[PDB]
Design a binder for this molecule. Structure first.
Ligand SMILES: CC(=O)N(c1cc(O)ccc1C)c1cn(C(C)=O)c2ccccc12
Ligand SMILES: [Mg+2]
Length: 103
């Protein structure tokens, strides 16, 4: 139980983070050229929220893998000096820091 309660805390904190705006919604491949071809396993906070609210996370490690997937995809598709890349570096450092601040 305590494993999944922290997942809720950190996802809520990521959802309300100032830098979360690229990650709240699944990328629309119709509007983002090349996204379908380049990113094999899309992930975003709303997709993690759906899975967490339906109980679909077995452990905290499945949850973190989805979180790290958001930021791996971000760095794969976006330049580090792009607006989205900069937002994702902020969010990745937040997650890694807060996740270690617990375990
Ligand atoms: C910033 C923004 O609003 N995006 C977005 C775009 C959509 O069409 C639908 C939903 C979202 C969340 C984009 C997210 N991107 C990521 C995560 O690489 C992007 C990478 C490149 C361009 C936009 C985004
Ligand atoms: Mg480190």
């Amino acid at each position: 139980h305590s494993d999944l309660t922290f997942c809720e805390i950190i996802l809520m904190e990521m959802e309300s983070h100032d830098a979360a705006w690229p990650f709240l919604e699944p990328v629309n491949p119709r509007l983002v050229s090349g996204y379908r071809r380049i990113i094999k396993n899309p992930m975003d906070f709303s997709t993690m929220r759906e899975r967490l609210l339906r109980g679909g996370y077995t452990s905290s490690e499945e949850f973190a893998a989805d979180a790290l997937l958001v930021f791996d995809n971000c760095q794969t598709f976006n330049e580090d000096d792009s607006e989205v890349g900069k937002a994702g570096h902020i969010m990745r450092r937040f997650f890694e820091s807060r996740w270690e601040e617990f375990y």
